[PDB]
From a paper:
Nonhomologous end joining is a critical mechanism that repairs DNA double-strand breaks in human cells. Following a DSB, the first [name] protein that binds the break site is Ku, where it rapidly recruits [name] to form the DNA-PK complex or holoenzyme. [name] ([name]) is a more recently identified [name] accessory protein, which structurally resembles [name] and [name] [reviewed in (11)].
Furthermore, addition of the core proteins [name], [name], and [name] led to the discovery of an alternate DNA-PK dimer mediated by [name]. However, to understand whether the binding of [name] and [name] to DNA-PK is mutually exclusive, we prepared a cryo-EM sample of DNA-PK, [name], [name], [name], and [name]. For the dimer mediated by [name], we observed the density for [name] central within this dimeric assembly and the additional weak density for either side of the [name] stalk that may correspond to the globular domain of [name]. Similar to the [name]-mediated dimer, when focusing on Ku, density is clearly visible for both the KBMs of [name] and [name], and both [name] and [name] vWA domains are in an open conformation. We conclude therefore that [name] and [name] can also bind simultaneously to the [name]-mediated dimer of DNA-PK. It does indeed look as though [name] and [name] can form direct interactions with each other in this structure; however, we did not observe a direct interaction when tested. It is, therefore, likely that they are only interacting when under the constraints of the DNA-PK LR complex with [name] stabilizing the proteins and [name] head interactions with [name]. [name] appears to have a predominant dependency on the [name]-mediated DNA-PK dimer, whereas [name] appears to rather stabilize existing DNA-PK dimers and is only partially able to structurally substitute for [name].
Residue numbers in the entry:
A (entry chain b): 245 to 297, 302 to 542, 548 to 570
B (entry chain A): 2308 to 2429
C (entry chain M): 654 to 760
D (entry chain a): 34 to 538
E (entry chain c): 180 to 202
F (entry chain A): 10 to 257, 265 to 349, 356 to 399, 405 to 486
Write the structure that this text describes.
DNA sequence: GCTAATAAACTAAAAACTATTATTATGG
DNA sequence: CCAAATAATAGTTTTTAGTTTATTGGG
């Protein structure tokens, strides 16, 4: 769904913009409609939340509360609303420009990516947007931008960088983390690796493997790298397996579900030529590196097929 | 340090305390090097986990009392931190210190010696 | 209890300690059988507040209760009975108490 | 485990005394610092224990019965009631109330107070990562004079250091300097040189001590002890962590509308057709497509979601250039070598990290976080260690795991095609961007919602008439941007936008 | 210790919340 | 004496917070426990009245989840369980109300606690049940219903350790009245679902540890009055028990116990798969944890009895009797031998159906054998098995060889003489064998009288 | 004279970090 | 048929992934 807005730069610059969800962790919009195990009537099935201590309590006898460290604070949602900080509806403003190398994918917040144009069929907005795109591209600057989806959506801090395409030009928005959203965890210096310094021959075998396990190719001698295994134009097979099972059960309401299909592995399997190349350095490094390791496969009673008594054609006493 | 189960450090600390008590059978004192070795090994990696600390400490103290003086503060501090035989081991170690009762009553009352004393464990 | 008129009356004493310690207020009004509720419900007869906080002000925002001074409660205690409302103790009041004042009290 | 900190407060005379008798006294400023520490611990980690004790007063409260040394609160999680009773003696009139219900005039004993706090630490029933002591005083010579008690306290402090007690002292307001290296600097738990002079300073770190930082600071925990499998058997242990993690508002608590005590709930399934109780095994899931209600159980439903066992399945090596930075699925994680199951894992990790940094190719792998989860495609980029001027690790060595979106991770997109712009307007935009050029810093921002939430909760805890107001770090400096820029906005607006047209819906 | 938060030992020093300022 | 003052102090030692108070409470509690556990006959009544006062206090006064009371209440429940053991069935006065308390304790006083106390309450209740039978058992249906609603809670917050509820829900306390009799079908539905979840799974959810044992215990406690041999649910549970034995620590021993109790309930569906059952029980009654050995032994003898019955009442009787019995028992040549002898004795049944001469044939060869084990100078650990088997075959026999009569009765009397030097368990075994041979002898009136007179005289 | 959906805090387990527990093998 | 010395499983409170909501614009 299109999100109209205005790219506000200060109080004097406004650009009508067209925002769109480009990348997202897609999920099916049909949850499992749990029904009866007897008559398959979800209507006859219903949950019953109850409050008590017995000493039963009602929904109309409780409020919202919170834990204040070693303490408990009763704080109703009404009070929460009244003292809530509230953002502005659909407001989206820029905060400034910074170097692209100041931000890395490690700071990429959110689970979605927003490809944003200027507002559809606003030529002035589009030309202004493209001028910003070219200027930022040449300056290698990225625009820190404050974003609010609507009145009731919390404000977010993210950055927009221009995606360069000959058919279209967009600013790609990815949310950025607050200092609240960070983990400061130390890790040992793998550079000062005295007890884990690999032998040179091991390093050479590793490089040989990577050469033999590289998933790209040199195309046309133009040095345009040719990937052999995209996974970006390849759909997630989970829904394919789901549909396999659904179809089987619909056709076979009693048969057990079929296993995963081989082509599903193949679309998950990288090119086997790369595997054949890697086969030898795999064994080389396996020999080269000493690695030593420091419950529910619940089968039937019988690891065998059948048993039981049978003594036909035998009455010799 | 080798703790796969008790026997290793238990018996070995026992014989160490024997040797310490029997520094050429206790007539000249120049193995304070070994006393410092064991003092570190106690403080090292067992001012942290402190479980086997008291174990070997009691072992050597039985086999050599005049060493826990380096750890009188330590044992006192760790007193109100267990609930089982470990407490009994600490009590035994304290018992081995007679030069150690210069002032202890405040330590006992502060550590509520009267309380654990009240519970009957023969 | 002692002043059973305080019973069937739901007093919501969260505030007033500078005037008189709120525990003392609760004890005295329970000795009259007051219905001390720790959170103001629809049946809360009156809000008892003498130490105005963010919570008391928030209650004032919701024009649904009477923000009674604890001095009014001491008045009811010494009278051994629920005094009728007075336009000098309820900092904020429900529209019913507003009509009560405007019908029997001058501005 | 947790951590222990005790605030030891002098009471003899200097705390109430002020340098000018019109500003904060070494007494009340200690009150403020401890209140700030309480707030910071409540926000960050209440599981730590905090204790406050007074010495040099005319009475005492320690169980050990040591005179002049009054204990206020035990080593315990920061409770708001502690803060309230503390603020009861806050300010120049709060210490008036202190001198009303309490007082001073009797010499203390540092040996005795160290004894008391050692007992207090002995009272801890939890793993204390550190044993820190906070001292609030400005003089040392009261014990620096009598060498008996001086050496006694030195011996006791040495013992505490043997116990691992992280003793600390605070440069405190005194009209005669902090006066150390006289009885201190030879007795404190110190291992670094900061200042040993007689500095007439009144604070060394009260500034950030009073600084109210509101964040969680989760302890380091391995997000997953994963096992990277190269082909089928060359498997190594790897520690997966989330160096970036979205913070969330603390869960709401169900509690009365009448007494506000916590209320547990219970949800049950009842036969809507009968009212009879329904078993978990008494129902089945379904999805209706067309005329067919496909009915299924649960275990099969999760198994059809499980394709691989938990771990990482190496799919190969792909050049870093083949990775679309505009393509992003969900926040990336960090992968460190782990050598606790597969010995030699860290050596191989070092080898592969070096080789990947050289060749500049990421490791594409099939990822199964845990069971009953469809594996994803993830790129492991070799991210090297980086250290600051202090050589403190600012970037860890290892790899960065970035999700690689599938074909079905996008949405349909109706739009217009590419539209050019004049190079003059591009140059104007370059000038304007350079005008408002600001340095990015990852910690320059906080959630205003969360900040205001913390302030509201605090005000509720302290029953303030009003809450603190959250400053916003996300505001664009519109007046400042216009001031810095000038009429360049008007120039470019006339350049692109015709004067008749106003950008509007 | 350098680069360590006073309030939380073992935790890195907490820099101020800061803000945006053009250069 | 000391109990009064200590319980008074404990009633006074819980007048504040200060979890150290709870620590001293549990110290004095353990002391009172170790004191009252000591035997007495007059201090016992003081223990009873103090049980009254103290149980009341710790029921009402705790009212909390604070561990300063949780440790104390946990030790309280342990002490009350060891006190229920047999510190006087005259506890029955208390038995009712404390029941209520602990039930309420499990829910209200223990409302946020998920630890040992629930387990202690459950085991106390179960001991109360299986100790007190049909004198005050009038309060179960309400509790049965409440726990029935409780178990179907949509949260797994009842841990495996809490699945003792099933053993609790295993109920035959008074008559197993009609209400839970009706609910038993839905009970079975729940058990089938739970055990299918346990035992047919690939979702990293075995949860078998306690859940398996508690389900088996419940089923045992209930199948005493249900599950006739015409249900596919019956054979499904049978298959579940099968898979229990080897899907690849003593849960399978509980499985063997459960089967042994209701081997008959699974008849007509256990004829098949005989050899696997035989071999698996054989190997099971060979391993450590002699509880496992005895469980397998009892299960095997019950299974053998049942299969003997069915094959005796079969026209297709040939299969089981010829394929396994004589072959395996001969291949046998410690308790292994007694098992083989018992197998001979039970196999004697169908010999009357087919080849009635082989009845007396095996009888005679058994006489020869026991004679050969009679004269050699241990040698007595297997005498009762011989007696049992020969009594069985004699019961099947109708035209006995009276030549072996003096020999057999002399063997019986010498065994009776060798009754000493006997471990009590097999003393009971041998007395059972003697009464069984007497019952078998009872079929032959005049021979009965003469032989019994002679043997009693000689003994 | 208009139900094309999305910004959803919920009652989510589908880690357990570290703490007693218990059979086992027992020992003489 | 009780006869003691030794590892496992699972009592915590932790994150994270299926969840459910009020604003969307179609006779």
């Amino acid at each position: 769904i299109h999100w109209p807005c205005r790219l506000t730069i200060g109080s004097n610059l406004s650009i009508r913009i067209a925002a769109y969800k480009s990348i997202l962790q897609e999920r099916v919009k049909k949850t499992w409609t749990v029904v009866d195990a007897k008559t398959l009537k979800k209507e006859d099935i219903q949950k019953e939340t109850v409050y008590c201590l017995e000493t039963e309590v009602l929904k109309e006898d409780i409020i919202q509360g919170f834990r204040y460290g070693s303490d408990i604070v009763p704080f109703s949602k009404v009070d929460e609303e009244q003292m809530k900080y509230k953002s502005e509806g659909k407001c989206f403003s820029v905060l400034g420009f910074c170097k692209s190398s100041q931000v890395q994918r490690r700071f990429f917040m959110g689970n979605q990516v927003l490809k944003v144009f200027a507002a559809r069929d606003d030529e002035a907005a589009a030309v202004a947007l493209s001028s910003l795109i070219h200027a930022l591209d040449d300056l290698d600057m990225v625009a820190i931008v404050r974003y609010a989806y609507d009145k009731r959506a919390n404000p977010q801090v993210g950055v927009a960088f221009p995606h360069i395409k000959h058919n279209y030009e967009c600013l790609v928005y990815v949310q950025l983390p607050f200092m609240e959203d960070l983990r400061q965890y130390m890790f040992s210096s793998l550079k000062n690796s005295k007890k884990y310094a690999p032998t040179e021959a091991q390093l050479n075998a590793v490089d040989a493997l990577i050469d033999s396990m590289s998933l790209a190719k040199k195309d046309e001698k133009t040095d345009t790298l040719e990937d052999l295994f995209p996974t970006t134009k390849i759909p997630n097979p989970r829904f394919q397996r789901l549909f396999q099972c659904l179809l089987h059960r619909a056709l076979h309401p009693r048969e057990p579900l079929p296993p995963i299909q081989q082509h599903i592995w193949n679309m998950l399997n990288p090119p086997a030529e790369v595997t054949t190349k890697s086969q030898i350095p795999l064994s080389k490094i396996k020999t080269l590196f000493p690695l030593i390791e420091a419950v529910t496969a619940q089968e039937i009673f019988q690891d065998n097929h059948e048993d039981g008594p049978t003594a036909k054609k035998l009455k010799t006493e | 340090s080798f703790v796969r189960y008790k026997e290793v450090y238990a018996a070995a600390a026992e014989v160490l305390g024997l040797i310490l008590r029997y520094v050429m059978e206790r007539k000249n004192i120049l193995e304070e090097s070994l006393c410092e070795l064991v003092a570190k090994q106690l403080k090292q990696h067992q001012n942290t986990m402190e479980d086997k600390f008291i174990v070997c400490l009691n072992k050597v103290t039985k086999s050599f009392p005049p060493l826990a003086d380096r750890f009188m503060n330590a044992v006192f501090f760790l007193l109100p931190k267990f609930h089982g035989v470990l407490k009994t081991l600490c009590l035994e170690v304290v018992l081995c210190r007679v030069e150690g009762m210069t002032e202890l009553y405040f330590q006992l009352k502060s550590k509520d010696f009267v309380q654990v004393m009240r519970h009957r464990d023969d | 209890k002692i002043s059973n008129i305080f019973e069937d009356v739901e007093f919501c004493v969260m505030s007033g300690t500078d005037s008189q310690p709120k525990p003392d207020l609760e004890n005295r009004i329970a000795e009259f059988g007051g219905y001390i509720v720790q959170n103001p419900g629809p049946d809360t007869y009156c809000v008892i507040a003498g130490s105005e906080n963010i919570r008391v002000k928030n209650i004032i925002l919701s024009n649904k209760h009477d923000v009674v001074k604890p001095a009014w409660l001491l008045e009811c205690f010494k009278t051994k009975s629920f005094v009728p409302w007075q336009p000098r103790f309820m900092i904020h009041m429900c529209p019913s108490t507003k009509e009560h004042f405007a019908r029997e009290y001058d501005c | 485990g947790r951590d222990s900190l005790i605030f030891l407060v002098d009471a003899s005379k200097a705390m109430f005394e002020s340098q000018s008798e019109d500003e904060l006294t070494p007494f009340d400023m200690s009150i403020q610092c401890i209140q700030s520490v309480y707030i910071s611990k409540i926000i960050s980690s209440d599981r730590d224990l905090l204790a406050v004790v007074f010495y040099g007063t005319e009475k005492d409260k320690n169980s050990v019965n040591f005179k002049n040394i009054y204990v206020l609160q035990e080593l315990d999680n920061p409770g708001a009631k502690r803060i309230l009773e503390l603020d009861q003696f806050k300010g120049q009139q709060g210490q008036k109330r202190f001198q009303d219900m309490m007082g001073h005039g009797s010499d203390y004993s540092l040996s005795e107070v160290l004894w008391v706090c050692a007992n207090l630490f002995s009272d801890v029933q939890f793993k204390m990562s550190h044993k820190r002591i906070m001292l609030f005083t400005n003089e040392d010579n009261p014990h620096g004079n009598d060498s008996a008690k001086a050496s006694r306290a030195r011996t006791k402090a040495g013992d505490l250091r043997d116990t691992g007690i992280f003793l600390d002292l605070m440069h405190l307001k005194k009209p005669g300097g902090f006066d150390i290296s006289l009885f201190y600097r030879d007795i404190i738990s110190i291992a670094e040189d900061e200042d040993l002079r007689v500095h007439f300073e009144e604070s060394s770190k009260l500034e950030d001590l009073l600084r109210k930082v509101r964040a969680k600071e989760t302890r380091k925990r391995a997000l997953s002890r994963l096992k990277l499998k190269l082909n089928k058997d060359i498997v190594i242990s790897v520690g997966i962590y989330n160096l970036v993690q979205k913070a969330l508002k603390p869960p709401p608590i169900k509690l009365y509308r009448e007494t506000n005590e916590p209320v547990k709930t219970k949800t049950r399934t009842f036969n809507t057709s009968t009212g009879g109780l329904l078993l978990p095994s008494d129902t089945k899931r379904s999805q209706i497509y067309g005329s067919r209600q496909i009915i299924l159980e649960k275990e099969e439903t999760e198994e059809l979601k499980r394709f691989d066992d938990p771990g990482l399945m190496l799919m190969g090596f792909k050049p870093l250039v083949l990775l679309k930075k505009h393509h992003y699925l969900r926040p990336s994680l960090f992968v460190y070598p782990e050598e606790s199951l597969v010995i030699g894992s860290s050596t191989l990790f070092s080898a592969l990290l070096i080789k990947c940094l050289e060749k500049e190719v990421a490791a594409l792998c099939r990822y199964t976080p845990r069971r009953n989860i469809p594996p994803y495609f993830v790129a492991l980029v070799p991210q090297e260690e980086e250290l600051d001027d202090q050589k403190i690790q600012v970037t860890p060595p290892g790899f960065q795991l970035v999700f690689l979106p599938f074909a079905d991770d996008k949405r349909k997109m109706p739009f217009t095609e590419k539209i050019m712009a004049t190079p003059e307007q591009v140059g104007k935009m370059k000038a304007i961007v350079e005008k408002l050029r600001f340095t990015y810093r990852s910690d320059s921002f906080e959630n205003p919602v969360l900040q205001q939430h913390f302030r509201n909760l605090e005000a509720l805890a302290l029953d303030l008439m009003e809450p603190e107001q959250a400053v916003d770090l996300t505001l664009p400096k519109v007046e400042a941007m216009n001031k810095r820029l000038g009429s360049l906005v008007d120039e470019f607006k006339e350049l692109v936008y015709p004067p008749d047209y106003n950008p509007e819906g | 210790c350098p680069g360590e938060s006073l309030i939380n030992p073992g935790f890195k020093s907490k820099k101020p919340a800061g803000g945006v300022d053009f250069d | 004496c000391s109990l009064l003052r200590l319980q008074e102090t404990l009633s006074a030692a819980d007048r504040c917070g200060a979890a150290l108070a709870g620590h001293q409470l549990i110290r004095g509690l353990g002391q009172e426990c170790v004191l009252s556990s000591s035997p007495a006959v007059l201090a016992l009544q003081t223990s009873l009245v103090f049980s009254r006062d103290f149980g009341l206090l710790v029921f009402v006064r705790k009212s909390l989840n604070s561990i300063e009371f949780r440790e104390c209440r946990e030790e309280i429940l342990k002490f009350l369980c060891i006190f229920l053991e047999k510190m006087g069935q005259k506890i029955a006065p208390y038995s009712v109300e404390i029941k209520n308390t602990c039930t309420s304790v499990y829910t209200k006083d223990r409302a946020a606690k998920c630890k040992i106390p629930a387990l202690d309450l459950l085991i106390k209740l179960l001991q109360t049940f299986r100790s007190s039978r049909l004198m005050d058992e009038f309060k179960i249906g309400e509790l049965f219903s409440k726990f029935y609603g409780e178990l179907a809670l949509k949260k797994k917050i009842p841990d495996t350790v809490l699945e003792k509820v099933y053993e609790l829900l295993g109920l035959l306390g008074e008559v197993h009245p009609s209400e839970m009799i009706n609910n038993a079908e839905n009970l079975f539905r729940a058990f089938l679902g739970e055990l299918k979840t346990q035992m047919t799974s690939a979702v990293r959810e075995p949860k078998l540890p306690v859940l398996a044992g508690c389900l088996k215990g419940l089923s045992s406690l209930l199948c005493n009055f249900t599950k006739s041999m015409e249900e596919d649910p019956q054979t499904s549970r049978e298959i579940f028990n099968f898979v229990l034995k080897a899907i690849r620590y003593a849960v399978p021993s509980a499985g063997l116990r459960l089967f042994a109790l209701h081997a008959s309930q699974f008849s007509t569906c256990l004829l098949d798969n005989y050899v696997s059952l035989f071999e698996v029980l054989l190997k099971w009654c060979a391993h450590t944890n002699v509880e496992l050995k005895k469980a397998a032994l009892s299960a095997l003898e019950s299974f053998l009895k049942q299969v003997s019955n069915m094959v005796a009442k079969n026209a297709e009787m040939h299969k089981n009797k010829l394929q396994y019995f004589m072959e395996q028992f001969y291949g046998i040549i410690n308790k292994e031998l007694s098992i083989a002898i018992r197998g001979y004795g039970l196999f004697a049944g169908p010999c009357k159906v087919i080849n009635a001469k082989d009845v007396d044939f095996m009888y005679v060869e058994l006489i020869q054998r026991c004679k050969q084990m009679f004269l050699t100078q241990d040698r007595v650990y297997q005498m009762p098995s011989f007696l049992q088997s020969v009594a069985s075959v004699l019961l099947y026999l109708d035209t006995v060889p009276e030549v072996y009569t003096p020999v057999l009765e002399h063997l019986v009397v010498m065994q009776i003489d060798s009754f000493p030097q006997y471990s009590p368990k097999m003393q009971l075994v041998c007395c059972r064998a003697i009464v069984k041979v007497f019952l078998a002898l009872a079929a032959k009136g005049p021979v009965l009288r003469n032989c019994i007179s002679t043997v009693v005289h000689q003994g």
